[PDB]
Amino acid sequence: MAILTDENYVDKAERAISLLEKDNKGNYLLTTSQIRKLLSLCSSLYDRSKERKFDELINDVSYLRVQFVYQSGRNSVRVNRQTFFPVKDLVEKGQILEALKEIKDRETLQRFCRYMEALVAYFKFYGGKD
Amino acid sequence: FIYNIATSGAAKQLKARSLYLDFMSEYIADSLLDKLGLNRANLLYVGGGHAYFVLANTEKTVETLVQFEKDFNQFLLANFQTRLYVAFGWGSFAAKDIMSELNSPESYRQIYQKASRMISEKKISRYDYRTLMLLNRGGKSSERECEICHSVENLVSYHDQKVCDICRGLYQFSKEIAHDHFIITENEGLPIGPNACLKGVAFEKLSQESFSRVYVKNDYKAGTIKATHVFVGDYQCDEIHKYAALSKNEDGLGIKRLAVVRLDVDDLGAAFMAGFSRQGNGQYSTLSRSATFSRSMSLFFKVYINQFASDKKLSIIYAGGDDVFAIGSWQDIIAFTVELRQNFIKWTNGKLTLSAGIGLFADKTPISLMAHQTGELEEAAKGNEKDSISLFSSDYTFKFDRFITNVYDDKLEQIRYFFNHQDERGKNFIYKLIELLRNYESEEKMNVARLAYYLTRLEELTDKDERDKFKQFKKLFFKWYTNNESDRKEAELALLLYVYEIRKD
Amino acid sequence: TFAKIKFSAQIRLETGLHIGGSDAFAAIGAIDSPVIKDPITNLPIIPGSSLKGKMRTLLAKVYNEKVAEKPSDDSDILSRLFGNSKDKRFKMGRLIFRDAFLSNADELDSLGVRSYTEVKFENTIDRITAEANPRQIERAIRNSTFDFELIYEITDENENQVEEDFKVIRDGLKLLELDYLGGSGSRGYGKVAFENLKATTVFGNYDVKTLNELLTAEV
Amino acid sequence: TFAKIKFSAQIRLETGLHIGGSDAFAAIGAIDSPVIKDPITNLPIIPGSSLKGKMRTLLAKVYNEKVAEKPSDDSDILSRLFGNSKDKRFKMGRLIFRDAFLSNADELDSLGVRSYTEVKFENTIDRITAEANPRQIERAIRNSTFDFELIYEITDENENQVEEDFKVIRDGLKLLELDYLGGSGSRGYGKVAFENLKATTVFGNYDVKTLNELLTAEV
Amino acid sequence: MTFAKIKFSAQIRLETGLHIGGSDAFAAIGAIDSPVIKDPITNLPIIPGSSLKGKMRTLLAKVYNEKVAEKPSDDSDILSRLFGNSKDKRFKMGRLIFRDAFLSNADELD
Amino acid sequence: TYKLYIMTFQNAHFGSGTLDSSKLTFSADRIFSALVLEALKMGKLDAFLAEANQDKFTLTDAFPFQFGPFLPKPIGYPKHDQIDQSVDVKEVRRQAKLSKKLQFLALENVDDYLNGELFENEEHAVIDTVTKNQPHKDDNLYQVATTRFSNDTSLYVIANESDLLNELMSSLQYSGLGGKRSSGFGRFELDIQNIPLELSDRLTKNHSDKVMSLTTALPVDADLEEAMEDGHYLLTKSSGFAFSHATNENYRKQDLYKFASGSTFSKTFEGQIVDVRPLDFPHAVLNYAKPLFFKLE
C-alpha cells in the first residue's frame, strides 16, 4: 500500500495544509523561511532525478530525510506561553517521513517532489507567510 | 468576384467591386422591369444577388424573361467568362394563394419553391453545347496575365501593372465611388449590361453627360434630377492599409493589427419562407408581411449599419441582405459587431439571431486570405448551434449573449481594472494565467494548485496597499478557474483581449 | 540512372530555436513573438522553406565565386540544386526539402517537461537614459529533435556533377551546424546538430557507401 | 575567401552570477529573484544575448569616437561585428554568440554541492528610521563553469579587417573580465574569467597560430 | 580622455571577529549560533560586496552630503556618480564596482 | 478500374489559383502532368505517352481515404423523389445547407445518400496559411496555404495495374505532388490495395444508364449533346502557367473548362488528352480529361 499515488497526493497536501495548527489570530505558525532549505533540496533532487539514475541519488535522499527530521526537531515557536514545532507538525500531518521511505526509484522520488510542491502551493494559498 | 484580389490596391478594388456588383443586381432588376414596361413597384426584394418580382402571367412575360436571361448570360460570358452567372426563376400562382382568408401555408411555400427549384436546376446545368465549345476553343498564346483577377482577355499596362479591361474599369470607378450620382451610358464606364456601362459622375458634370438612367446613393431627398434611389452600407473611416497602425492609441498602447468581421443573419431564408406561419395556424403567410419583413431587414442593413458604424475606425465593405463584411481596427471591429448584434436583437425582439466571425490579421495581409479565414470563423460560429461569435479562431466560440454579458463587459473589465494597477513585472503573470488555463486537462488538480501559488505571488509583487486591492483577483480568478470549462474559456479570451489592448510594440 | 537519395537525420537543438510564425496563424499566441507550430499537434516544427533558404544563403557565401543581388544571378551549383526561375535548364532543382516535425515528444515527456516551448525574457538598455525595456521571445526546448529528410534526385545526363553536388550538400549541412537555424541566432538561438546523418537510395540503384562514410567523416 | 573561426573558453564565475529570469515563470520555491535556467535540466545558463549586449556596451566606451545614443549609431568597427538593422552593409554582423551551459556539474557534485544555485540574503537600511528591510535573491554557484563559444566569419570583405576584429574581440573579452556579467554587479556579482581561451578554424582554411598566441598571452 | 579601468586592490585584515550573517536555515546541523554568510562550496566566510558598498555609501553620506538624504536616491552628485542612482538619468551606472572578498590566508591560518 | 492506389500525405499544397489557396484534394490533370514530368526526367516519356494513347488507361481525381474509399457528392441528385418530407422549413433548409457543404461520402453509404439520408462531412485535413519572407529585400511577405491531413486520412485514385505506372507512382512519392514541392509540401507514401468487391462492380466506362463521373473530364465534341440535355455538372477552369524546361519566360497555357466530379450523366463519353500549349511552343502541354464512371441506382 503506497500512501502517495498519482491520484491523491494533491488532495493529501490539501487536507494536510487544512489540518496545520494556527495561532490565536488565525495565522500559520509555519513560515516558508523555516522550510526554505527543505524546498531547495527537494527541487535539486527533482531536477537531478530527470537525468541521473537513482543509484547515485540515494545519498541525496538520505540527506534530505536527515534535513527533514532536523528541521522538525529544531524549529520551535513560543507564543502565548506555549511552544510549538511547526516543521514537526507539518511533517506529521503531511505524512512525509514514511513517504520518504517508499522512495525506491525515479517515479516515487518525483511523486514525493510533486507532493512537496503541492504542499507549498496550498500552504501559500491559505495565508502561509514567507 | 469581390474577394479574389491578390496584389496591392486590394482595398479600393474590393469596395469598388462590392458597389459594382450591387449596381449590377439593381441594373438587372431595372432593365428587366423596363423590358416588360413595368417599374420598381413590381420589385419585391433586390439585394445579395437575389431579386424577386411579381409579374403578369402571360406568354409574353415568359418569353421576355427567357430572352433577357439569355442576353445577360451572353453578356456575362463575354465580360467575365464563367465567374458570374445569372439564373432566372418563376412560378405561376393565383390571387387566392396569397389572401390570408383563402390560402393555406404549404401553397404559399410552394409558390416560392417552384421558382427556387427551377433556379436550382438552371444553376446546375449552366451552359449549352455551343457555349461550352466556344469556351474550350483555346488557341491563345499569352505570356502574361492580370495581376488581380488573373484574366487573359484584353490585358493593358497601367501603373507598371498588367490589368484586364474589367480591372481597369474598376480601378477607374474606385475614384468615382465618392460621388453620389451614377449614370448609365452606352460605352463609358464599367460594362454593367448589354450595350450599357455604369459611370460614377459628379453632380455638376451630369448636365454634360448622355445617359439612359441615373442612380443616387444614400439620399431620401427628391433632387432636381429624376433619379432612382438606392441605399447601401458604405461607411469608411480611413484607408484599409492604415487600419493596422490605427489600432494604437494616443499613448501608443494597442497591438498593430487589424480585424475583419463577417456576420450573418440566422435562418434568413427560413424566416422569409415560414417565419410568420407559427402563429394563427399559418394564417400569417401572405406576400405583404413577408415583404415588410424584407424591407425591415433592408432598412436595417443598408441604411442603419452606417449609423452603427459612426465614429468607428472601420469600413463596411459589403452590407446587403444577411451577409455583413467589415474591416478596420480590431477594438472598433469588436465594438461595432457587439453594438450591431444588440441593436438587431432589440430591433427584431429577440426572434432572430446573428452569427459572427472576427479574424485578426497583421498589416498588408492579402484580402482574399482575410475573407477566407473570417468565413471559416463565421462557419464555426454557425456550428455552435448558431447564435454564436467566434473570435480569432474556432477555439473561442461563444454564445453571443455569453460573450457580451460575461466576457466583454464582465471579466475583461474586472481584468483591465486590477491589471492597470500592476507594473510590467506583474503584468507578465497574465501570460502565466493563460498557460494554466490552456493546460488544465493535463494535471487538473496540480494545475489548480499551481494557480493558487502563482496568484498569491502577484499579490506580493504588488505595491504596499495596492496589494490590498489585488486581494480580489486571487478570489476572482480562482473561482473562474474552478467552476467549469466555459468560464475558463471566457477568462482565457478576456486575458487575450487585455493582452492585445496593453501591448507596446 | 534515375535514383533518389534520402539524407535522413535527427536535428537536435543545442540551444533554443525561434523560427517564428504569424501571430494569428500558428494559433492566437499571447506571447509577443510566437514560434511556428503544427496546426493539429501544436508542436514546434522546422519548415523545409527555412532549411532550404538558410542552406542556400550559407552556400551562397562559399560556392558563388562572386556576389548576387538576387537569387537569380547565382552560381550553377546553387541553381542546379535549389532552382532558378529565370533559367530554362534549372527551373526546378534536384533537392526536395521536407518539414521537420517533433520526433522525441515521448522522450521529453519522460524527462518531465510540461511544454515543448519556453518563454525567454530579455531587455534592451538605453544607451543614454539607461532604462531597460523588457521583451519576450518564444523558443523550442533545447533537447527537442526533429526528423530531417532531404531528397536529391539523380537522372540521366546528370551523373557527371553528382560527385560535386554531394560535396555541396555536405558543406551546406556542416555550415548549418556551424551557423544558426532561423531566428535571433547571433544572440545564442538556433544552434543545431545532426544525428545519424546517413543517406540511402530509395528509388533506383546507386552506391552510397562512400557517401555514407564521408557523411560521418566530413560531416 | 570564406572561413569560420570558433573562439572557445570556459566562463568560470569568481562571484555568484545572477542574470535573472521572470518571477512569473519561476518554480514553486519561496521568495527569490530567480536566475534564468534551462527548461530541461533546470540548470543556470548564460544566454548569449547577455554576453552580446555587455560586450557591445563595453566596446562602445572604447571604439566609438562619438557617444552613440542608439546601437544604430555605433561605429563601423562595432556595427560590422555586432550587426546593424539600419545599415545596408552591416545587416548581418559577423559575430555569432551562443548560450553557455553548465559544464562542470560532475566536478561540483564531487565537491559535495547539493544545489547549483544559492540564495543570498541582503537587506536595505533606512537612512533615518534605520529599519532593515530584508530580501533574498538567487545566484549561480561561484566556481561554476560554462561552455563559451563565439563564431566569427571571414568573407571577401573581411580579409583586410580580420586583425582589427580579433583585437576588438580580445578587448571585449578583457573588458568583460574587468566588468561584471549581467546582474547586480556593482555590489559584487557577475565577476567572470575566460579559461582555456583558444580559437580554432572550424570552416575553411585559416591560420590562427598568432591569434592563439595572442589569446594565451593577453586573455 | 580615453576609457580606462583602475583596480584598487588590498587585503582586508580583520582586527576583531566579523559577523555579517546569513540565514538560520542554512547553518550547520547541531549549531544554535547565528551563522555568518559563507561560500556555498568551500563553506568559508566571505565579505559580500553589497556589505562593503552599503557601509561605504552610508559612511560617506555623512561627509559628502550637504543635506541629510532621506533615501540613497537623494545623495549628492559625487556619491550618486560613484555608487549609482536609480532615479537620476546621468548617474544610473556608477563608476565603482565592488567585489565579493574571499578568504585568502587560509594556508597561513592552517 | 484495376487498382486502388493510396497516397498518404503529411503536408501538401494544391493551388486553386493563388499561392495562398490550397484545396483538400487535387484533380487528375495535375497527377497526369506529374507523371509526364517524372517520365520525361526518367527518359521513358514515349512509353507513357503510348500507354496514355490506349483506351485501357483510366485515371480519376484523388478522393479522401479513411478506412475506406470516399466518393464525391453526385451533383444533380438532391431530388425530391427520395427527400419528400413533411418537416418544417427550418429543418429543410438545415438539411439543404448540410448537403451543400457535403463534398465526399463513404463508399458503404453512397446509395444511402441517394435514398434521402443526410450525412455530414468528416475531419480529413486542416488548411492553414503560413507567412514567409525574404531577408534581403524587405518587401516580400508571401503566404502559402497547406492541406495538413489528420486521423490517418489519405488520398486515393483508381487506375490500371501497370508496372510503368507503379514505378512512376514510386518515383512520385519522393518527388511531391503540387505546390512548393521543394519546401516541405506535396510528399507522400504510396500503398497499393485491391478495389473492394462493392466498388469494382460499379466502376464502368461504356453503357447508357445514369453515370456519375470520377474525373474532371471534358467529353469529345461528338457526344457533348447528351451531356448537355440530360447532364448535371459543374464547370472548372484549368488555367495556369505551363511549366517548361525549354523556354526562359513563363507562358500561360490556354484556359480550359472541364466537367467536375462527380457530374452525373445519362451516358458515358470519351475523354481527351487535349493540347493546351500556347502557339509557337516547342513541346506539347497535355491536359488529361478522361472519365472513370460510377453506376447509380
Side-chain angles (χ1 to χ4, degrees), chain D residues 91-173 175-183 185-190:
Chain D
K91 298 293 183 182
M92 295 296 172
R94 58 202 53 173
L95 274 181
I96 293 174
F97 285 81
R98 307 283 215 206
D99 291 12
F101 306 102
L102 189 64
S103 77
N104 68 338
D106 291 331
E107 165 178 351
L108 290 187
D109 278 311
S110 84
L111 279 159
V113 298
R114 292 180 179 91
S115 296
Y116 301 126
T117 44
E118 67 158 337
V119 65
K120 187 158 179 294
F121 297 83
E122 307 181 327
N123 66 356
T124 187
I125 298 163
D126 279 333
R127 288 211 186 276
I128 307 300
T129 80
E131 305 282 329
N133 173 55
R135 88 183 152 278
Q136 70 213 42
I137 80 172
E138 198 169 1
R139 289 208 299 177
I141 291 317
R142 172 170 162 236
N143 272 291
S144 313
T145 62
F146 300 81
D147 277 1
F148 169 78
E149 293 83 3
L150 180 65
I151 301 174
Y152 168 76
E153 65 169 3
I154 297 169
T155 68
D156 58 292
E157 182 65 26
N158 290 318
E159 312 166 54
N160 46 302
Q161 320 170 337
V162 193
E163 294 293 328
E164 294 293 328
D165 289 350
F166 287 163
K167 260 166 199 73
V168 176
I169 283 164
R170 291 192 256 112
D171 265 8
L173 289 166
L175 279 182
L176 183 62
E177 287 221 12
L178 296 173
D179 186 74
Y180 64 92
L181 183 63
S186 198
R187 294 181 288 285
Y189 298 2

Side-chain angles (χ1 to χ4, degrees), chain F residues 86-99 102-114 116 118-119 121-181 183-188 190-197 199-276:
Chain F
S86 279
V87 291
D88 51 309
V89 176
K90 204 164 269 210
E91 297 315 295
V92 159
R93 296 293 299 274
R94 278 178 76 89
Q95 63 84 30
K97 288 301 176 189
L98 210 44
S99 296
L102 183 63
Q103 65 183 357
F104 292 119
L105 294 174
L107 158 73
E108 66 183 1
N109 64 7
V110 176
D111 291 331
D112 199 57
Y113 174 82
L114 303 194
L118 175 73
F119 280 148
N121 276 347
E122 284 88 15
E123 190 277 331
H124 283 152
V126 65
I127 297 89
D128 55 281
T129 300
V130 298
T131 300
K132 299 143 157 39
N133 81 313
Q134 203 161 0
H136 65 279
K137 67 184 289 184
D138 266 6
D139 291 331
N140 298 120
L141 183 63
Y142 66 99
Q143 289 82 12
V144 186
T146 63
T147 318
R148 179 66 179 86
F149 297 88
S150 179
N151 210 346
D152 188 358
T153 295
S154 296
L155 298 192
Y156 64 91
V157 294
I158 299 160
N160 273 13
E161 173 51 71
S162 297
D163 282 20
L164 172 62
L165 199 79
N166 280 29
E167 61 86 20
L168 277 174
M169 284 291 117
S170 296
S171 66
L172 277 296
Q173 65 183 357
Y174 303 90
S175 286
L177 205 41
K180 292 206 173 300
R181 291 148 40 210
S183 285
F185 317 115
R187 297 194 39 175
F188 62 89
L190 181 85
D191 181 73
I192 301 299
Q193 294 179 357
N194 306 323
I195 306 184
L197 295 174
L199 188 153
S200 186
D201 61 348
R202 214 89 83 81
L203 304 160
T204 51
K205 215 182 280 184
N206 296 115
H207 62 86
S208 187
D209 54 77
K210 308 284 176 211
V211 298
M212 183 278 288
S213 173
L214 291 179
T215 300
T216 314
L218 167 82
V220 291
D221 311 333
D223 50 17
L224 280 181
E225 294 294 328
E226 293 83 3
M228 295 296 172
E229 293 82 3
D230 63 358
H232 305 341
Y233 47 90
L234 183 63
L235 277 296
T236 316
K237 185 177 180 180
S238 62
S239 57
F241 272 93
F243 182 76
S244 279
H245 286 301
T247 47
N248 269 354
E249 293 82 3
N250 290 318
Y251 280 171
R252 184 176 176 87
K253 52 207 182 164
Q254 276 87 337
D255 55 345
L256 187 153
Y257 298 85
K258 292 181 181 179
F259 285 46
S261 49
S263 302
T264 68
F265 306 88
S266 296
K267 202 183 50 64
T268 73
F269 64 78
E270 182 65 26
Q272 308 176 201
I273 301 299
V274 65
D275 171 77
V276 298

Side-chain angles (χ1 to χ4, degrees), chain B residues 425 428-429 431-432 450 453-454 457 461, chain D residues 23-32:
Chain B
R425 185 179 67 189
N428 292 342
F429 286 73
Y431 310 107
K432 181 69 176 177
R450 270 180 202 123
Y453 177 81
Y454 276 127
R457 181 66 178 171
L461 294 174
Chain D
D23 291 331
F25 289 89
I28 308 301
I31 62 170
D32 291 331

Side-chain angles (χ1 to χ4, degrees), chain B residues 394-454:
Chain B
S394 184
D395 73 345
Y396 307 153
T397 187
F398 300 97
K399 287 293 184 183
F400 293 110
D401 58 4
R402 287 210 214 122
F403 167 72
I404 294 166
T405 306
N406 297 352
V407 190
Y408 196 63
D409 314 298
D410 172 63
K411 294 181 176 67
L412 182 50
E413 299 313 307
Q414 295 298 109
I415 278 163
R416 299 192 179 92
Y417 173 34
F418 299 127
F419 293 96
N420 284 325
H421 305 357
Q422 291 270 9
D423 63 358
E424 294 294 328
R425 185 179 67 189
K427 185 183 287 185
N428 292 342
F429 286 73
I430 62 170
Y431 310 107
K432 181 69 176 177
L433 309 161
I434 279 160
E435 294 293 328
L436 289 159
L437 278 157
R438 261 156 163 170
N439 302 320
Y440 173 88
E441 305 93 326
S442 296
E443 182 65 26
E444 190 277 331
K445 296 183 290 294
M446 185 66 229
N447 268 290
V448 176
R450 270 180 202 123
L451 189 82
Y453 177 81
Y454 276 127

